[PDB]
């Protein structure tokens, strides 16, 4: 299993990356990137913890002990082992704040494994290139070298004004093929953790009128010549004492510029078929969406805890008004958790025999989180009061003359004044900080319930009078069904 | 297995029942009560349906074919057989509108079976009376006679007069104990289906300061001398053509008066111990609470169906704003269902080996429905538009001169004019009649479903910082957990 | 000023009215309709009350004393006198439950008075019919004869049936034209109080591709031969003691069928011009929309009062969790009231010199009621608890042997046990009867979601970046605007 | 009228203030503070602009031209002139983001002016002192020297420890009564802009069982010996090109500690009486609450604008689902504005002849904002998409090789790619930074808006059944009203 130290070294590979105005010499070391880079290191080192060997690792089919990240769930029971693996990672690293650690996006490659043939036999202009072997090859490399391969699938909003038939810029497209590979030019909008990966997982989602020279699926090293990762600015805090979570690292998002970059045939999985990009890219995001639900449920759990802690510390916890508000937080958690459990119980098997959770249920589970996060945030903030705003710094607390005033301001029915600040600082980082803010934003444009969901229900499912919801009502109304 | 015929006959036993201003001579026959009575009769006859023998009946341990209402789930799979039993009943009778058919409240008696001794052992003032044997005797009678025994547990609201503690409350209490039994005087409030039972299941839920003599658990014949069942006025409709659901029967709710009622020792399960009334009465309500959720999930399913039907018939189903609203109804059902399924997967076993669903989850599931049901039905009413209001009556539709106008008014893309009226009539019955409005109040007649459920749970498990919710937040805040 | 007796007698004119399957011989005396009929009578008699002379009547410009329903406001103060007139009617008649009493819809005719000629000169196919004198004549008749003229504007639902081009719709249309007048055939849908008017106010609203032959504005007697008023079934209760409100009358809604009805030229205001129906029919609903808001603010006030009465009678009013819930109701009333007041302070004058309230503000006020009334219903019901459901009849309350149990059950800190039943009966009528339910549907139809509220705003106002909301944002963003 | 320069120089007076760990040598010049200080300076310079003399200044009673912040409204029209003054300030300075510029809290001193004597006559422990003259003295000083005097009323949370809420509080209390003044020791919990005022307005709000020794009202210089202003860490951004709003200054919040400071008698307004602290501190906060509402209506206006702009630039504005959402935003602003209008129309006069707005209405107005602010934020962000996240810094946009790609990326149906970035940056600052998050918290921190607002309301208005809401419901229920 890869080591954190090894991960950090592999970052200094001459990849060209900007964080805002600032060009980055070495992601592992630069003040704007090093902290998150060290979280990914932390991710790898976690798997060497003797006490975590059972939850984090398994003996693979080749006799090699690996991260359960690579393990395939065969049934619901298997899926709970997988979930427990993911939850252990999240609980350990920054209060489950990071959504694109390696286990999150790496598992998406299993959709290829489920049926590698289709990706080659459905390519347009793939001639006699062995794309199927390209899949098998990378899956082995990915797994055995324990690589980190972030997703780069999102396209620009694509000009909603011009003649769509003339699709020039800014989308990434094949501008020429040769005997050695293809050349691509354009950009990938919104990619998370691109600067911190070994390879990037280039792909796309179907949209009506998608050219075909734009249907590209590949995995290329991050430092492939002609690639520039332009990151938004980093929101990491420099004072760990004042910001226990925000100072731990910003999971950067970026737009990736491909400047006529050459992609060897060996690194391509599929090209050219808009029809194939319909539904197959969709499956690629299944495990990502499932992982998000896991993260969401843990977050709901954290908020309940924070609410119970801050509220017991101040001594308002036994007020009917307060407890009723805590009840809403518990409700929210139980609602999130129920979508998670129900989805895991109503799953199915992929071609590769992998047991997949029910997408209808976990996708609505995600919609439920997005639609109510504002509500619960407001409740936590209301319960915390000034504890998330008027936080005395260490210098003020430790002051000889006035330090004792702060101790008195924060003392409660359970003593331990320090705890008020500790709790308040977590709530602040989470909800009153740039860093905490991007944690809405992340899962936000990713969905938009009303919008996406019903464009994402009648896609694999049937929400018509002839579907499952039509039976009972029809019978009750005395109308024939079927 | 009892027939509806036998059931109907058992109603004419001299029970004293008021419906509004009138004393009812025969509940089975009276215009105000006969319809619901025939719904219970229908419940019984259903089990004799040759094609329903598998879902509805089983062979008991004594080699007797009985209703599956008497069957014990011993694992999750068995629980789903139980639920399928209940759902078959629900879908078949008045669109799952009735909440206290015999299978809903009869199974709560297994709570006694799980551990009969404790009810006697914990009694105060009932020594030498064989309460344990009383339990076994009634369980046997209830089952073998196939009796219907509604719960009568709900107490009068507390009188908040400053001087309340210096006079009698209206609550039911033991007023005398004798060699033959106990004399009982007072009121049980908001009882559902009392007038239609063979026996009533007398009991109480704990409240701070509840006196020993008010703690009574027993089952007595509905027609016990001194018992008067005061029902609310009946909202049953007379025209089945215009009212397909509301004409099928009104599940009456009652205030039961006990005028110095004599109860033989043989009908008594427990008396005198407030401490016992803490956890145990909650166990009795578990199974009925779980049944309510089953019914609530079907109702959510019905609502989505009606929305899809009426929305497709009018031709508004295609509009994106309309699709989004139908989707959020799908969301509601999915959330209800998720609670149901999650509670079934995380259940536990009683001392009697019976597999119970998770009360934390299904009870918060109930609270989710109760808090949202009005908002949800408003969406349905809004989507149906004028079709739930401007409904042509049969005579207007059949009118030789003007009927054709109504056919045109109700014609849409689907091209079946009659259907719009069929759907309009069930929506109207469900949410625009007094019969329909009853469904909002009879299970939510106290203050705040969410908090009520939350307060009940923290008397059953730890919702404090020392409980399961404090662990993750404590860790994150650097606070010790134990 | 017309008397109630005069109104009642005018109803007996051989008009053809169905209520459900029942043909009505006289709307004034029939069991299904007499009660609402008597509410309109009450409306008239109210104006003869000496003590009410000031708020209800004024001396007209001809020196005759008439109801202030005919009085014109010329400024903000004048609008207040008008509203005070409306509110006094509403408060007097059935808790403000009726929304189409004569003063509500009669005043819409002043739309014609603001500019009568335009209706003439914009007509197509009415050359030489002096529709202007027609207008002036009816306006005088309307007022001096003190008639009641309900609106009949609404059209059958836009359905794309099998062939909405090969076959004709149910819409009212000009079928033939003569030297005497016009012949119309078709239907007006969802009219309110039609069966109770002396005349009906025929009109239409614009709709993409509406035929000129369907554009018709007129006022004809209700008993005009060939006219049939088909009412939905009546929901009025037969027992005033148990239903203090729902027994007072049902403001019926109807479908009006015109079987080749002849309208004399002298009863026509405009025909034939789709362009005219684009802006003027909306002006007609302006005053009714304003009256709707007034009724809504009142209803919010009623609801607050009910919550305060029931919570005080029970004794929970001082509980912090109850105070907070009641605050929500007060918040809703104040929000409704704020829109009301703000619209009156920011109005404008019509050509007729009449001061109109701000439509943007009072229409959004209306939308606020529609979007929050379920939440308000829910909040009141939750506070009232069992009192709105478990209501003892007079017979039960007065029973000699068991009646005293109900006194004890309903006793509280403020004594007067009977009051709890009184309050509960009002709440039950308002929210848990057929009659109460239609007071939801009154507006539960007049606009698909918001597919017609910003398409009815952005296109009827600026509501663009160049509009009034674009100024501040543009500045702050350092952009354009100008 | 004071000058920005003059104000800046007044700051360097040896006041001891910390921003986090940093002791501040000069509030006017320090990097953590100078930006907000220059905003207060901007506030003063605004008054000297010739183009704004009309709206910002007036000739006072003494003949001297002054800022309209010192002007008294004597009627509704006058109040509107005052509102136009405040809004002009807000719209000019950082998009109305600052809530405690001098005009916001300075006007609260008019409370004293309304009735000066009562503050002395009600004092306890100051027998023989003339305090009334002090009010007139400071009032003159305040106005003529054009001083800035922030509020400092909020006390430490009354922790239910035992001896923390008993005597040994951090609460500011009178420890010593000299014949030259008093000596005070303790803490003022939360204070906004204290470190930026010439004086601080010391005061307190009543709470059950508050000592008379903690009831102190006064105005002392900020650089008084023994006073330390401890500020939370500052959230000011460094780069105005990336942060157009957040770089403009952080309106800091403080805990002020009084280590045995001596207040001269000529600065005391009242001491010793808890009964006085009941209603009079409420009147102090009246004008502040009104100003907050003015500010909240502007922000709601701003939010609508941003939503329109971004939605139009992306070309998503025509979508029915989107325009529906924008209409909700317009509804929020309309609702907020209506509370504002209505409060101004239903005000009253103070003893001093000042026309004050209606507090019941503008306080429920504030509550409406506090409750909905989170949801409307979410809608803005969801509408903006990646624009508020994936923002190309200046350097990336200007880049010679790649810049072009960002231009094509932000191109929309309306061109002007740069605008997407400009709007996006404004939104990010508002809701995705800590500077922004402070704004939706600093508002409410005391408890629950709707409840507390209503709790404070029951004190000013009669909200019982004997109150104004009891009338209508009582008549409807047949209950006597008095």
Annotated binding residues of A for FAD, written as ranges, equal: 151-153, 157-160, 192, 457-460
Where are the extended beta strands (E) located within D70-215?
Answer: 151-152, 173-177, 181-192, 199-202
* Number of C-beta neighbours around residue C198 at 10 A: 23
D377 to chain A, minimum CA–CA distance in Å?
9
Taking the CA of residue C324 and the nearest CA in chain A, the distance in Å comes to 9
Q: Do A321 and C319 touch (CB under 8 A)?
A: no
Q: Is the dihedral of CA B456, B460, B463, B468 positive or negative?
A: negative
Residues of chain B with C-beta less than 8 angstroms from the C-beta of D319: 320
Cα of first residue to Cα of last residue in chain D, in angstroms, is 54
CATH 3.40.50.150 is right for the domain spanning C273-482? no
DSSP 8-state assignment for residue B44 = H
Set of chain C residues whose Cβ sits within 8 Å of the Cβ of D302? 472-473, 476
CA distance A372 to chain D (A): 9
Q: Tell me if D101 is assigned to a ligand binding site.
A: yes
Q: Per the omega criterion (within 30 degrees of 0), is the bond before A170 cis?
A: yes
Contact B438 C378 (CB under 8 A): no
- Residue D363 assigned as binding residue: no
Report the C-alpha gap between D365 and C361 in whole angstroms.
16
CB pairs under 8 A between A and B: 197
Coil, helix or strand at residue C457: coil
Rounded Cα gap, residues B422 and B240, in angstroms: 12
The closest alpha carbon to C388, from C427, C418, C419, C417, belongs to: C427
Closest-CA distance, D176 to chain B, in angstroms, reads 41
Cα–Cα distances in angstroms (integers) from residue A448 to residues A451, A456, A472, D379, in the given order: 6, 11, 30, 10
Contacts of residue C174, Cβ cutoff 8 Å, sequence gap at least 6? C182, C183, C184, C213, C214, C216, C271, C272
- Residue whose token pair is 């403000």: C96
Facing residue for D337 by CB, picked from C328, C342, C475: C342
B458 annotated to bind ligand: yes
- Specify the CATH number of the domain C148-272: 2.40.110.10
Of all residues in chain A, the one with the smallest CA distance to B321 is: A450
Interface test with A, best of B477, B481, B482 (most A CBs within 10 A): B477
How do beta strands B199-202 and B216-221 pair? antiparallel
Residue of B64, B113, B60 whose CA lies nearest to B287 = B113
Give D-chain residues touching B326 at CB under 8 angstroms.
Answer: none
Q: Could A190 and D390 be called an inter-chain contact, meaning their C-beta atoms sit closer than 8 Å?
A: yes
Could you count the other beta carbons within 10 Å of the beta carbon of residue A178?
9
- Interface contacts (A, D; CB < 8 Å): 187
Contacts of C328 in chain B (CB under 8 A): none
CB neighbour list of residue B359: distance below 8 Å, 6 or more residues apart: B286, B289, B290, B343, B457, B460
Using a CB-CB cut-off of 8 Å, the residues of chain C touching B437 are 431-433, 436-437
- D160 has binding-site annotation: yes
Touching subunits of D (3+ CB pairs, under 8 Å) are A, B, C
Q: State the chains in contact with A (3 or more Cβ–Cβ pairs under 8 Å).
A: B, C, D
Q: Which residues of D touch B320 (CB under 8 A)?
A: 319-321
- State the pairing for strand pair C216-221/B355-356: unpaired
CATH 3.40.50.880 is the classification of domain D1-147? no
- Contacting residues for A41 by C-beta, under 8 A, at least 6 apart: A4, A5, A7, A8
Strand stretches in C40-88, DSSP E: 57-59, 65-67
How far is it, in rounded angstroms, from Cα C52 to Cα C39?
A: 17
Determine contact, residues C259/C200, Cβ cutoff 8 Å.
no
Query: Do C411 and B321 make contact, defined as CB atoms within 8 angstroms?
Result: no
Sequence-distant (6+) residues with CB within 8 A of D119 are D112, D131, D132, D135, D217, D269, D270, D276, D280
Q: Is B309 annotated as a binding residue?
A: no
CA atoms within a 13 Å half-sphere pointing along the CA-CB vector of D185: 11
Q: Are strands C355-356 and C348-349 parallel, antiparallel or unpaired?
A: antiparallel
Q: Where along chain B do its domains lie?
A: 1-147, 148-272, 273-482
> Cβ separation of D321 and B321 shorter than 8 Å?
yes
Mutation site, D318, D319, D320, D382, interface B, largest B CB count within 10 A: D320
β-pair type (A181-192, A253-264): antiparallel
Report strand pairing: A199-202 vs A151-152. parallel
Determine the 3-state secondary structure of D176 from DSSP. strand
Cα C388 to Cα C422: distance, rounded to the nearest angstrom: 10
Helix runs in B93-221, H state only: 102-105, 110-114, 117-121, 131-144
CB contact burial A224-263 (16+ within 10 A = b; e otherwise)? beebbbbbbbbbbbeeeebbbbbbbbbbbbbbbbbbebbb
Nearest CA in chain C to D341: C342
Of C165, C179, C181, C283, the residue nearest C224 (C-alpha): C181
Q: Residue C262 pairs with which residues in a beta bridge?
A: C183
| Chain B residues in contact with C388 (beta carbon < 8 A) | 441
- CA–CA min distance A38, chain D (Å): 23
Is C53 within 8 Å of C43 (Cβ atoms)? Answer: no
- Which residues in C lie closer than 8 A to residue A321 (C-beta atoms)? 320-321, 324
Q: Distance between the two ends of chain C, CA-based, in angstroms?
A: 56
Altogether, the residues listed in chain D come to a count of: 482
Question: Is D434 annotated among the ligand-binding residues?
Answer: no
> What is the chain A residue with the closest CA to B302?
A473
For residues A22 and B300, give the distance between their C-alpha atoms in angstroms, rounded to a whole number.
54
d(CA C267, CA C181): 9
**Are B134 and B268 contacting, i.e. CB atoms less than 8 angstroms apart?**
yes
Please check whether residue D335 is in contact with residue D368, taking contact to mean a CB–CB distance below 8 angstroms. Answer: yes
How open is the CA angle C292-C296-C299, to the nearest 5 degrees? 140
Q: Are B21 and C395 an interchain contact pair (Cβ–Cβ within 8 Å)?
A: yes
Determine whether the annotation assigns residue D88 to a binding site: no
The string of DSSP codes covering D209-277 is: T--GGG-EEEEEETT-TTEEEEEPPP---S-TTT-TTTTS----EEEEEEEEEEEEGGGEEEES-TTTT
Q: In what order do the strands lie in the sheet with D199-202?
A: D151-152, D199-202, D216-221, D268-271
How many Å is the maximal CA-CA distance in chain A? 83
> CA–CA distance from B29 to each of A68, B33, B200, B221, C328 (Å)?
68, 7, 21, 20, 46
Closest-CA residue of B relative to C163 is: B413
Per-position DSSP letters for B45-99, written without gaps between them: HHTT-GGGHHHHEEE-TTS-EEEGGGPPP-SHHHHHHHHHHHHHHHHHSGGG--S
List the structure tokens of A168: 């020039």
Contact D419 C477 (CB under 8 A): yes
Cα separation, C323 vs C308, in Å, equals: 9
Q: Give burial (CB, 10 Å; 0-12/13-18/19+) of D210.
A: middle
Binding residues of A: 100-104, 151-153, 157-160, 192, 203-204, 457-460
| Residue B149 known to bind ligand | no
Phi, psi of C4, deg, nearest 5 = -55, -40
| Residue in chain C nearest B392 by alpha carbon | C232
Counted residue by residue, chain A has a size of 482
CA D1, CA D44: separation in Å to the nearest integer?
8
The C-alpha atoms of residue D428 and residue D436 are separated, in whole angstroms, by 8
Asked whether residue B21 is marked as a ligand-binding residue, the answer is no
Which tokens hold the place of C380?
Answer: 């009141």
Give the whole-angstrom CA distance, residue C217 versus residue A423.
Answer: 69
**Structure determined by:** X-ray
Question: Closest Cα of chain C to A13: distance in Å?
Answer: 40
Q: Which residues of B fall within a CB distance of 8 Å from A305? A: 465, 469-474, 476
Tell me the nearest-neighbour CA distance from C61 into chain D, angstroms: 31
Query: Nearest residue of D to residue B319 by CA position?
Result: D320
Q: Which residues of D touch A261 (CB under 8 A)?
A: none
Chain B nearest CA to D387, separation (Å): 24
**Which residues in chain C are contacts of D368 at CB distance < 8 A?**
331, 335
Q: Are B330 and A244 within 8 A, CB to CB?
A: no
User: How far apart (Å, rounded) are the C-alpha atoms in residues D152 and D281?
Assistant: 12
**Residues of chain A contacting D412 with CB distance shorter than 8 Å:** 157, 159-161
- Partners of C227 in beta bridges: C258
End-to-end CA distance of chain A: 55
Rounded to whole angstroms, how far apart are CA atoms A96 and C404? Answer: 62
A221 min Cα distance to partner chain D (Å): 20
Contacts for B209 with CB less than 8 Å, ≥ 6 apart? none
User: Strand A216-221 and strand A199-202: pairing?
Assistant: antiparallel
Q: In B106-248, where does DSSP find H-type helix? A: 110-114, 117-121, 131-144
Distance between C205 CA and the closest CA of chain B, angstroms: 17
CB contact under 8 A, A409 and D187: yes
> Is D456 within any annotated ligand binding site?
no
> E strands along A112-154, which residues?
151-152
Q: Chain B partners of A422 at a C-beta cutoff of 8 Å?
A: 477-479
Question: This structure's resolution (angstroms)?
Answer: 2.5
């Amino acid at each position: 299993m890869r080591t954190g130290k090894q991960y950090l070294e592999s970052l200094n590979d001459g990849r060209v990356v900007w964080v805002g105005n600032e060009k980055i010499d070495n992601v592992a070391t630069h003040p704007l990137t090093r902290d998150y880079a060290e979280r990914v290191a932390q991710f790898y080192d976690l798997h060497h913890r003797p006490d975590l060997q059972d939850v984090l690792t398994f003996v693979d089919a080749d006799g090699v002990r690996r991260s359960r990240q690579w393990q395939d769930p065969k049934d619901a029971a298997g899926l709970r082992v997988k979930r427990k693996y993911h939850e252990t990672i999240l609980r350990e690293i920054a209060a489950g704040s990071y959504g694109r650690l390696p286990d999150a996006h790496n598992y998406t490659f299993t959709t290829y494994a489920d049926d590698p043939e289709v990706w080659e036999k459905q390519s347009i202009g793939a001639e006699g290139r062995n794309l199927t072997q390209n899949i098998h090859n990378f899956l082995k490399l990915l797994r055995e070298k324990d690589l980190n391969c972030p997703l780069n699938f999102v396209d620009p909003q694509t000009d909603r004004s011009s003649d769509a038939a003339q699709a020039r810029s800014p989308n990434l497209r094949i501008v020429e093929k040769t005997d050695d590979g293809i050349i691509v030019n354009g950009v990938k909008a919104v990619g998370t953790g691109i600067a911190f990966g070994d390879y990037m997982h280039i792909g796309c989602l179907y949209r009506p009128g998608i050219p075909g020279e734009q249907v590209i699926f590949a995995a290329i090293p991050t430092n492939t010549p002609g690639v520039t990762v332009f990151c938004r600015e980093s929101t990491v805090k420099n004072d760990p004492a004042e910001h226990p979570l925000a100072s731990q690292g910003d999971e950067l998002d970026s737009t990736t510029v491909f400047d006529n970059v050459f992609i060897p045939w060996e690194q391509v999985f599929h090209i050219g078929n808009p029809e194939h990009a319909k539904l197959y890219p969709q499956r690629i995001f299944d495990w990502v969406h499932y992982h998000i639900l896991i993260r969401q449920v843990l977050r709901a759990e954290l908020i309940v805890g924070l609410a119970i802690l801050i509220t017991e510390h101040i001594g308002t916890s036994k007020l009917p008004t307060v407890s009723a508000r805590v009840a809403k937080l518990v409700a929210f958690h139980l609602a999130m958790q129920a979508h998670l459990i129900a989805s895991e119980e109503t799953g199915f098997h992929t071609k590769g025999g992998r047991y997949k959770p029910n997408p209808l249920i976990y996708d609505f589970g995600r919609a439920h989180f997005l639609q109510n996060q504002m509500s619960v945030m407001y409740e936590l903030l209301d319960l915390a009061g000034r504890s998330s705003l008027m936080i005395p710094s260490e210098g003020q607390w430790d002051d000889s003359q006035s330090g004792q005033w702060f101790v008195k301001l924060n003392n409660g029915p359970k003593g331990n004044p320090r705890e008020r600040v500790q709790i308040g600082r977590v709530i602040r980082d989470l909800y009153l900080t740039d860093w905490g803010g991007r944690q809405f934003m992340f899962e936000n444009f990713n969905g938009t319930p009303l919008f996406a969901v019903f464009a994402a229900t009648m896609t694999r499912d049937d929400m018509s009078a002839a579907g499952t919801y039509g039976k009972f009502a029809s019978q009750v109304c005395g109308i024939e069904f079927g």
